[PDB]
Design a protein around this nucleic acid. Structure first.
Lengths: 130, 1364
RNA sequence: GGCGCAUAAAGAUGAGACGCGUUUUAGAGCUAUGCUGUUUUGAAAAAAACAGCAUAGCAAGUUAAAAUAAGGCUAGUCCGUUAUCAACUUGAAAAAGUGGCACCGAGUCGGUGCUU
């Protein structure tokens, strides 16, 4: 039990408390992905829309910068035959130092994806842990 | 002037409050230090401190054990390399120098490329001759021919780095190898544990059926088809399902409420096993042990399967066959894909990224993700047999190194190493006389007790040595000392008791601790036979008779067995019912029966002279674990023993400890009797008290003798003071910070010591919605209401059982569909006019429970007194109340409360129990922080030895401050600002001082200190209303908070006027001035400027994110070792910054390298922090900066306050992070309206109060269009986020006609736009908008910086504009 | 706060073994076509690949070695993620010390009096 292991287990416990309870065989994820994860999101589809935020970084205002970069997208199975996809996320520590690249910019495929994700609301409980 | 201090304690926060006598909090001009222009500040003297939660210390223990396991493994490799160090230079010189260089790029590698066999050709012949190492050692175990030396070495260096588990002990034998004897063992322990309606499996034999080649989720149905048992969800069947990886449940099986999931594959097996075991009792516990044992056995039969040529290679020769069923059954599948699907072949084997077979080896996948991906494809195919039957049994396309070969007993590896050295001993000289040493360094499991093998430089080790040289497992015995290290072992990780220190607590199942628990339960059990006409408890000789006549017979005994084997047998008592013990005893004499089975003697365990002998045999069993040291300490007691119990008594283990030591139970004696705790708790007499009531007693000597030794000897350091507390480390961090801020807070108010300091803490609202908690036991009562009553109320209206959180229908359905006042029925939809009354009025207690509240139609049905209701109402329903107590619809306490017509009403002991029931505050952290904060500021002496108690410590609950908050319209909801810490502490002062100034005499039960025994049985008048502030009694109305009530109100309508300006009842001093109290209190809770500070920290922790990631051309990677340049080898990214530094310097800008003046932040990671502070200017020249001004290097930790124009406060969390600092001056009427409107059905007070709040919100609907523009100009001043603000203004405009309750709840969720900390994204009505993080750290460089003190009172302001 | 059968629980700390996972290198990739040097009865050519790249189709595809927080000195089969911490003045460190009081008010504290 690490600082994030048992709270991941109570995370999927309250996921099983929110919906149909018959869950079985939680995925044995490694410690390397769990101990650097900011947000555990649950959803229905494998394609996860990732979030976004703006800034005031030396002009370039009202653009869209994604923050939660996926590093592990595994699934868990319930009884019977209903698939839910786990997603672990990491906050993007982008600074005010680049050659206007590798700071994550919009590339508006994710913008339209977030529009559909917010309009349909397929997101399930998304909570912070460390 | 006198003053008083109030303290809220928490995890995140701590609140400090300073009041005078007149309750106007002071306000003082403080001095500013630095080089700014504001030479004086004028601040209030009231505030809070919030900070990061105090993390525990389990992650550091985990990382430390990982580091030491890796260092032990590398040095086992070092020993085995050193034993071949001579003759491997004979074969090929730089061979070990190349196995050390197996990681770097071939260009800077200083040898040839191929590690083994040197050249190119023999390496390829090695791979296509030996495909893997399991094939290699499965070859050369059965090889008469001589093998190559480096070949045997690389077979053996793999052999000792993967050793298995040492959870099994001894050597393997068919009593512990195969599943036959283990399944016989579990059916024996099941048959022995129940000894009734059993099951026997002598006919069916699961030695091959449970070991078969099938699917486990079908194999348990096979076994329940063979052995009948109970069912497919029976307890025997569910435990077999636990033995095969499945996760059954037991709520339908134990006849228990909550479900019970169990599996062995999770890391948290034991923490859930004891969690369920405390719910069900310990009498099953060892049986589950065998279950886990049985499970491991079948997993053994999963890996080793070939039993035909099973000699000399049971492991390696097995799963190479699995390699064969991987190989051809790969090709088959390829020969089944291209024939039928030419598409989805490029995305299966050339994919690399989509959970296919390409990602199953060359990428990131698992067995189960790949099985789920090829389920729909391969299940779709037309002709594919022997694959779906192989997929459900988890054995296709399956690698060697699973996550489920963590069930390898090391003896298998040791046996094939034994063979691998026997079949080479005939050839090589050095290897013939070192096989003992090689097998020894394989099997050397460094034991628990011998600790870290240190040489005094440790912080954690304790083992001592009989010599001084380099420690090897060659010679582990004659170097380290056994008995001295064991003696230092037992005293180090013993646990002292908080109830009595300097003592070693007893084990969890000692004989003495078991007698303690059974005599703590049996001293509160009461029996009723026909003839006593009033219930009575047991006597001492009855307790001796029942522990000699029923407990020695069976482990668990029910009340039926009690009344049919004791009252009927020798007492000749027949018509007896027992109220105390419910149905069974949760306390059990398990090890009594256990050691009775082990020694097979009845005299010896029952003889009272062998007590320390038995308890320290149990102590040395529960303390040690390995098989060697466990036996010679029993050789001390080898005189009594019979040499057949040696292989029997050393088998049982224990885990966990009790609660209290031996010197506290059978230790100290009474000054007037000479008896111990146990001596009274089996021989007391008629006053059948309890143990905790004996702790709760004041008059007896034992509690005072406890608090004699609860203080230490000489006063320790304050870190050593907090070192032996309890709780989380978070509240320990809070306690240390609140002692620091008190000890600094005395300094600021003229250095005069205070008068009254108040403390409390409260937290942990994690009930998880209580949706199934009612229907598990409480609502489930009506399911045994059918057992007694018969009225199936849900049969006429099935109403759901998860929305019972509304209290009125909840208390209706907990009332049989009836009334407890008059014989009638009720309307379910007309419950709004029906009234909720209380069994005891609001002038005697305060509680909102089912024990208090009842529901009815008319208040006249209760009665016309403030006492218990009338005699006819209890006696006309004395029949039915015995049923709804018998159906367990209500508890015993409220039924005994209504039947006070027998006891006259409010008895003197009863009203004493109510008047002190609120003020007994029995949480240990409160008493210990009281002791710590007493012993610091209250230490002056006089002409005698006793202490001048200068400053009064005082300790109040959260109930009184919550009531003073609620009843007088002083509301709070947590999500507005973080002022609700500090303001909370303020009320903790007021209800503090205005209770001690008004009650001087009755402070002798909730001040920490030696005071009198002056009780309350003669402090409350047993008659009518006595003289106002001139009488002998303290009060009559048992609710303490009627003192604060301007005008009390009870159900009789007697609107009795307690006087306006109240004066204390013995000395004549005004304590509570009505015309100048609530004006002052409502002014101070509406004050705008409170000093909250976020304290600074240096970020200790990990170097970088714990996930090394593959190579890339970006230079911001952190290397693995020194010379592994991460543009080739990759590694760590995103380092954690500990603290930034503000540096003024010059850079070599331009093509002419001209030194231009710069002033910037620079992040410093923890990687070079010590490298920073050993020499800062040389490291900064190495970074690439010149002209370092050493005085001007400004250290700037995380959470540092920057203030700039229009009062904008931003606080700096990293080099490129900022967090909002300012907060809201939101006045009292707005917060009162927001709490009252946002809980339109969530107050549960009076119907008149309901119409008052309804008309209040309907007249003050004018507020939600002024809150919005306050937030508008506020966020336009201090946030400057225009876009999302305009979005939420338009979104507010779009819901203008929305109803009130939903709009108030959405506006308190809207408040989190403007808290402190990092900004977040908030759930609005619909328009969930994006967070706006700040990274533009340029504006910080020209602002002002505040190095503030710990309480925020003291401060200094440094400027960065002219900083040059 | 849930004191919840009216109790009040018990709490944190420390030793050992795994089994994984991750990352580089080693497991000579092959065939065909098209781009880069040279050879040759030679005048650049006539073209042979020995090597490198790209594009299509084929073949296998499991296992190892190293490291698993940079490293440190106190050189151990030790230690390096927790508890510890505003500046300033002392002090190696420990630890000590560094700031005027009332009154009228309140938009993140302001204003007035007296005074070392």
């Amino acid at each position: 039990m690490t600082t994030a292991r048992k709270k991941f287990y109570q995370a999927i416990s309250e996921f099983e408390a929110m919906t149909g309870k018959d869950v079985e065989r939680t995925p044995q994820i490694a410690d390397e992905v769990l101990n650097d994860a900011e947000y555990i999101a649950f959803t229905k589809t494998e394609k996860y829309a990732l979030y976004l935020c703006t800034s005031n970084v030396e002009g370039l205002e009202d653009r869209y910068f994604l923050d939660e970069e996926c590093l592990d997208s595994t699934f868990l199975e319930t009884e019977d035959n209903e698939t839910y996809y786990i997603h672990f996320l990491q906050e993007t520590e982008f600074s005010e130092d680049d050659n206007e690249d590798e700071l994550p910019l919009a590339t508006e495929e994710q913008i339209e994806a977030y529009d559909k994700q917010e309009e349909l609301k397929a997101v399930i409980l998304k909570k912070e842990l460390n | 002037k006198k003053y008083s201090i109030g303290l809220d304690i928490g995890t995140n926060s701590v609140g400090w409050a300073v009041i005078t006598d007149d309750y106007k909090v002071p306000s003082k001009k403080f001095k500013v230090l630095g080089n700014t222009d504001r030479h004086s500040i004028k601040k209030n003297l009231i505030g809070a401190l919030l900070f990061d939660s105090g993390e525990t210390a389990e992650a550091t223990r985990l990382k430390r054990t990982a580091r030491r396991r890796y260092t032990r493994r590398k040095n086992r490799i070092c020993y085995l390399q050193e034993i071949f160090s001579n003759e491997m230079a004979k074969v090929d010189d730089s061979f070990f120098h190349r196995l050390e260089e197996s990681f770097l790029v071939e260009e800077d590698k200083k040898h040839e490329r191929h590690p083994i066999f040197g050249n190119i050709v023999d390496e390829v012949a090695y791979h296509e001759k030996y495909p893997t190492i399991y094939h290699l050692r499965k070859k050369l175990v059965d090889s008469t021919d001589k093998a190559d030396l480096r070949l045997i070495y690389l077979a053996l260096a793999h052999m000792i780095k993967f050793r298995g588990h040492f959870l099994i002990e001894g050597d393997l034998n068919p009593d512990n190898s195969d599943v036959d004897k283990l399944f016989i063992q579990l059916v024996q322990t099941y048959n022995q544990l129940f000894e009734e309606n059993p099951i026997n499996a002598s006919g069916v034999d699961a030695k091959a059926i449970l070991s078969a080649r099938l699917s486990k989720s079908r194999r348990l149905e096979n076994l329940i088809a063979q052995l009948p048992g109970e069912k497919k969800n029976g307890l025997f069947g569910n435990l077999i399902a636990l033995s095969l990886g499945l996760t059954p449940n037991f709520k339908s099986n134990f006849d228990l409420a909550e479900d019970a999931k169990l599996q062995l594959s999770k890391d948290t097996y034991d923490d859930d096993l004891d969690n369920l075991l405390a719910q069900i009792g310990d009498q099953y516990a060892d049986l589950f042990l065998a279950a886990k044992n049985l499970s491991d056995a079948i997993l053994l039969s999963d890996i080793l399967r070939v039993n035909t040529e099973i000699t000399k290679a049971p492991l390696s020769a097995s799963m190479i066959k699995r390699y064969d069923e991987h190989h051809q059954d790969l090709t088959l599948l390829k020969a089944l894909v291209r024939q039928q699907l030419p598409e989805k072949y490029k995305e299966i084997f050339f994919d690399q990224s989509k959970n296919g077979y390409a990602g199953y080896i060359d990428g990131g996948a698992s067995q189960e993700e790949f099985y789920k991906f090829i389920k729909p494809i391969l299940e779709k195919m037309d002709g594919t047999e022997e694959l779906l039957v192989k997929l459900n049994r988890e054995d296709l396309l399956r690698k060697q190194r699973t996550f489920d070969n963590g069930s390898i007993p090391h003896q298998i590896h040791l046996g094939e190493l034994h063979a691998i050295l026997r079949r080479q001993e005939d050839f090589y000289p050095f290897l013939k006389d070192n096989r003992e040493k090689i097998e020894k360094i394989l099997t050397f499991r460094i034991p628990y007790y011998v600790g870290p093998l240190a040489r005094g430089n440790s912080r954690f080790a304790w083992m001592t040595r009989k010599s001084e040289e380099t420690i090897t497992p060659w010679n582990f015995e004659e170097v380290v000392d056994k008995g001295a290290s064991a003696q230092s072992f037992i005293e180090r990780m013993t646990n002292f008791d908080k109830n009595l220190p300097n003592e070693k607590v007893l084990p969890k199942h000692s004989l003495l601790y078991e007698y303690f628990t059974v005599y703590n339960e049996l001293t509160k059990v009461k029996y009723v036979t026909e003839g006593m006409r009033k219930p009575a408890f047991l006597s001492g000789e009855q307790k001796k008779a029942i522990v000699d006549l029923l407990f020695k017979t069976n482990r668990k005994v029910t009340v039926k067995q009690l009344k049919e084997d004791y009252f009927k047998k020798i007492e000749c008592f027949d018509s007896v019912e027992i109220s105390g013990v419910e149905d069974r005893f949760n306390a059990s004499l398990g090890t009594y029966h256990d050691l009775l089975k082990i020694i097979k003697d009845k005299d010896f365990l029952d003889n009272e002279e062998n007590e320390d002998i038995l308890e320290d045999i149990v102590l040395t069993l529960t303390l040690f674990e390995d098989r060697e040291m466990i036996e010679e300490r029993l050789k001390t007691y080898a005189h009594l023993f019979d040499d057949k119990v040696m292989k029997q008594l050393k088998r049982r283990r224990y885990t966990g400890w009790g609660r209290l030591s031996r010197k506290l139970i059978n230790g100290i004696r009474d000054k007037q009797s000479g008896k111990t705790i146990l001596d009274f708790l089996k021989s007391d007499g008629f006053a059948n008290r309890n143990f905790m009531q004996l702790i709760h007693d004041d008059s007896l000597t034992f509690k005072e003798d406890i608090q004699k030794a609860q203080v230490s000897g000489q006063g320790d350091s304050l870190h050593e003071h907090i070192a032996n507390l309890a709780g989380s480390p978070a509240i320990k961090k809070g306690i240390l910070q609140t002692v620091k801020v008190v000890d600094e807070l005395v300094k600021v108010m003229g250095r005069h010591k205070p008068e009254n300091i108040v403390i409390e803490m409260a937290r942990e609202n994690q009930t998880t919605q209580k949706g199934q908690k009612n229907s598990r036991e409480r609502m489930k009562r009506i399911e045994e209401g059918i057992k007694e009553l018969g009225s199936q109320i849900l049969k006429e209206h099935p109403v759901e059982n998860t929305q019972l959180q509304n209290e009125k229908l909840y208390l209706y359905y907990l009332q049989n569909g009836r009334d407890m006042y008059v014989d009638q029925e009720l309307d379910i939809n007309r419950l709004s006019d029906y009234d909720v009354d209380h069994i005891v009025p609001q002038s005697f207690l305060k509680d909102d429970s089912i024990d208090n509240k009842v529901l009815t139609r008319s208040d006249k049905n209760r009665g016309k007194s403030d006492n218990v209701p009338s005699e006819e109402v209890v006696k006309k329903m004395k029949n039915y109340w015995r049923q709804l107590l018998n159906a367990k619809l209500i508890t015993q306490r409220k039924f005994d409360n209504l039947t006070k017509a027998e006891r006259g009403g409010l008895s003197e002991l009863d009203k004493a129990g109510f008047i002190k029931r609120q003020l007994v505050e029995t949480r240990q952290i409160t008493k210990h922080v009281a002791q710590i904060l007493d012993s610091r500021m209250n230490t002056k002496y006089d002409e005698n030895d006793k202490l001048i108690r200068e400053v009064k410590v005082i300790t109040l609950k959260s109930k009184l401050v919550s009531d003073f908050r609620k009843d007088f319209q002083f509301y709070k909801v947590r999500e507005i600002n973080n002022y609700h810490h500090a303001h909370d502490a303020y009320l903790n002062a007021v209800v503090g001082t205005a209770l001690i100034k008004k009650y001087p005499k009755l402070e002798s039960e909730f001040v920490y200190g030696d005071y009198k025994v002056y009780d309350v049985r003669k402090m409350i008048a047993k008659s009518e209303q006595e003289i106002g502030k001139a009488t002998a009694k303290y009060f009559f109305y048992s609710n303490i908070m009627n003192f604060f009530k301007t005008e009390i109100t009870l159900a009789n309508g007697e609107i009795r006027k307690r006087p306006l300006i109240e004066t204390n009842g013995e000395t004549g001093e005004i304590v509570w001035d009505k015309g100048r109290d609530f004006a002052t209190v409502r002014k101070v809770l509406s004050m705008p400027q409170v000093n909250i500070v976020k304290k600074t920290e240096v970020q200790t922790g990990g170097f970088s994110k714990e996930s090394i990631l593959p190579k890339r051309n970006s230079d911001k990677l952190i290397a693995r070792k020194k010379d592994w340049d991460p543009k080739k080898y990759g590694g760590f990214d995103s380092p954690t910054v500990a603290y930034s530094v503000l540096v003024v310097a010059k850079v070599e800008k331009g093509k002419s390298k001209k030194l231009k003046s710069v002033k910037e932040l620079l992040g410093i990671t923890i990687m070079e922090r010590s490298s920073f502070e050993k020499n800062p200017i040389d490291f900064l020249e190495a970074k690439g900066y010149k002209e370092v001004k050493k005085d001007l290097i400004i250290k700037l930790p995380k959470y540092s306050l920057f203030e700039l124009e229009n009062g904008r406060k931003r606080m700096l969390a990293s080099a490129g992070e900022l967090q909002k600092g300012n907060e809201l001056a939101l006045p009292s009427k707005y917060v009162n309206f927001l709490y009252l409107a946002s809980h339109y059905e969530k107050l549960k007070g009076s119907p008149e109060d309901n119409e008052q709040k309804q008309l209040f919100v309907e007249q003050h609907k004018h507020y939600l269009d002024e809150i919005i523009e306050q937030i508008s100009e506020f966020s336009k001043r201090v946030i400057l986020a225009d876009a999302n603000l305009d979005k939420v203004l338009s979104a507010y405009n779009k819901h203008r006609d929305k109803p009130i309750r939903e709009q108030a709840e959405n506006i308190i969720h809207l408040f989190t736009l403007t808290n402190l900390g990092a900004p977040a994204a908030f759930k609005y009505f619909d328009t969930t908008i994006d967070r706006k993080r700040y990274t533009s750290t340029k504006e910080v460089l020209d602002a002002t910086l505040i190095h503030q003190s710990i309480t925020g009172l003291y401060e200094t302001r440094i400027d960065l504009s002219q900083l040059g």
